[PDB]
């Protein structure tokens, strides 16, 4: 159920055996927006996936994959670049070869950047900028962390890196010591042998070095005419089961489909503004940091302000003592969410962090949920409220509150 790490021929491997008819192959390269030299280099390097290699052209890579009936996908986060390809289990060797060729020899033709790669990045950046909530969350991330993981993931409208910079970054990043291989087919030994045989020609460089994360605080404001948002942010140390339990105790999302909820945030909203503003919370683990955020949205700024004050009071109320039933409910919900975040074969923000970390990412993490006690949650909350939080306000700025008025 959980990936088991292994190392063959200097290649990091992590396999999983499932009873299905399909499979998956991915490479998790530590070359995300955290390590980029300039702005937007990681995005363009990721967009260069499955382009004209030294042995094949883009036409071949696309048309012949279509003939074989397979899907090729790419992904970019603030800390990773993921190249994946799902297929029927009968075509493992071909896709292993394709991924190895893409990683190793992916000759960067100067006229492809100005014809196929850059417009796609522009369109993706525009689509991201249209989404208000994603922009607000990115601004909160940038305000909380200084520059380590607080960079800008997508390409800004006023940047244009040369092909030489991308080629240099690719030559410095695509090395045998800077990624791993994730497979979840019905056979593991065969996939392991294939990956060991094929991913052994890339030169063995050295992992990229980045400074430890620097944590601070700050508040940003912006104007909008549509719906209004007010997001809180509490930077936290490396993720622990207590943090997941706290995030599930805060709650915000209903269990039953058409209902309100009995979590602290739901009750705060109900007793504050008669369910005219919704508050949800979630946790985003990282390599050496975490961010717990509370998002309050609605159309009435007065209701948003009132429910924000009520939710802050409710969160502050957790530092004294917690009844056992609340802890049990939070533990159950957190365990359910954490285990349900593993079913898809696509690597989300939770599974990738567990896989990259080699210190019992999932095998012992689940066992640590049942040992959470109210004292531990109280201590975590008390340590969380020492430094001030970071807020982002979107909409009418004369009613949306500051942090000092919460």
The nearer residue to other proteins, 67 or 211, going by C-beta atoms, is 67
Please write down the long-range contacts of 60-69, taking CB distance under 8 Å and 24 or more positions apart.
Answer: 61/98, 65/98, 68/94
Closer to other proteins by Cβ: residue 98 or 318: 98
C-alpha distances out from residue 80 to 30, 62, 77, 182, 188, Å = 5, 24, 5, 14, 24
**What is the x/- site pattern for other proteins, positions 170-199, by CB under 8 A?**
------------------------------
User: In this complex, which beta carbon is closest to other proteins, that of residue 68 or of residue 208?
Assistant: 68
Q: Which is nearer to other proteins, 97 or 337 (CB)?
A: 97
- By beta-carbon proximity to other proteins, the closer residue of 90 and 405 is 90
CA distances for 258 relative to 241, 249, 261, 297, 338, angstroms: 29, 20, 9, 18, 23
Q: Kindly state the smallest distance separating residue 65's Cβ from other proteins, in Å.
A: 11
* 53-92 binders of other proteins (CB under 8 A): 64, 67-68, 91
Contact of 267 with 279, CB cutoff 8 Å: no
* Sequence-ordered list of residues with C-beta below 8 angstroms from that of 211, at least 6 positions apart, any chain: 148
Residue 203: closest CA among 105, 97, 108 = 105
Looking up tokens 């369109």 gives 123
The H or E element spanning position 333 is helix 324-340
Q: How far is the CB of 59 from other proteins (least distance, A)?
A: 13
Q: Which of residues 87-106 bind other proteins (CB under 8 A)?
A: 91, 94
Query: By C-beta, is 91 or 108 nearer to other proteins?
Result: 91
Dihedral sign, CA of 351, 235, 226, 134? negative
Give min distance, CB of 23 to other proteins, in A: 16
Q: Which of residues 251-270 bind other proteins (CB under 8 A)?
A: none
For other proteins, the closer CB: 167 or 197: 197
CB 49 → other proteins: shortest distance, Å? 21
The 3-state DSSP class for residue 274 equals coil
C-beta of 297: minimal distance to other proteins in Å? 51
In angstroms, give the least distance from the CB of 94 to other proteins.
Answer: 6
CB of 48 to other proteins, least distance (A): 24
Asked if 244 contacts 267 with a C-beta cutoff of 8 angstroms, the reply is no
Number of residues binding to other proteins, judged by CB under 8 A? 5
> Where does this chain bind other proteins (CB under 8 A)?
64, 67-68, 91, 94
């Amino acid at each position: 159920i959980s990936y088991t790490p292994k190392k063959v021929e200097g290649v990091s491997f992590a396999g999983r055996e499932t009873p299905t008819a399909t499979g998956s192959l991915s490479v998790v390269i530590n070359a995300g927006s955290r390590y980029q030299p300039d702005a937007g280099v990681s995005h363009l390097l990721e967009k260069f996936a499955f382009k004209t290699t030294e042995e094949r052209s883009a036409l071949r890579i696309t048309r012949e994959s279509e003939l074989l009936g397979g899907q090729l996908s790419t992904q970019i986060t603030r800390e990773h670049i993921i190249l994946t390809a799902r297929f029927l289990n009968e075509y493992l060797e071909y896709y292993a070869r394709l991924l190895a060729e893409v990683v190793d020899a992916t000759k960067f033709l100067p006229f492809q950047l100005t014809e196929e790669v850059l417009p796609t990045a522009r369109i993706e950046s525009e689509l991201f900028r249209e989404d208000i909530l994603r922009v607000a969350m990115a601004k909160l991330h940038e305000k909380a962390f200084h520059r380590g993981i607080g960079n800008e993931v997508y390409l800004p409208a006023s940047a244009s890196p040369s092909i030489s910079e991308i080629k240099d970054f690719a030559s410095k990043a695509y090395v045998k010591s800077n990624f791993s291989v994730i497979s979840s087919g019905p056979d593991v030994q065969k996939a392991s042998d294939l990956c060991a045989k094929y991913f052994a020609v890339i030169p063995d460089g050295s992992p990229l070095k980045s400074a430890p994360t620097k944590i601070s605080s700050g508040e940003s404001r912006v104007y909008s005419k549509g719906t209004n948002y007010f997001c809180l942010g509490f930077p936290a140390p490396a993720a622990s089961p207590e943090l997941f339990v706290l995030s599930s105790i805060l709650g915000g999302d209903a269990a039953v489909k058409w209902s309100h909820g009995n979590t602290l945030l739901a009750k705060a909203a109900g007793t504050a503004s008669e369910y005219k503003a919704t508050a949800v919370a979630d946790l985003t683990p990282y390599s050496d940091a975490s961010l717990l955020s509370v998002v309050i949205s609605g159309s009435c700024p007065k209701a948003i302000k009132a429910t924000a004050s009520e939710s802050f009071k409710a969160l502050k109320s957790l530092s004294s003592n917690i009844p056992n039933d609340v802890v049990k409910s939070g533990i159950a919900m957190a365990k359910t969410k954490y285990l349900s975040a593993f079913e898809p074969v696509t690597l989300n923000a939770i599974s990738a962090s567990s896989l990259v970390s080699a210190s019992k990412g999932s095998d012992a993490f689940i066992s640590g949920f049942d040992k959470v006690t109210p004292a531990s949650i109280s201590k975590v909350v008390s340590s969380l409220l020492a430094k001030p939080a970071s807020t982002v306000a979107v909409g009418n700025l004369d009613v949306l509150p500051y942090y000092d008025e919460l």
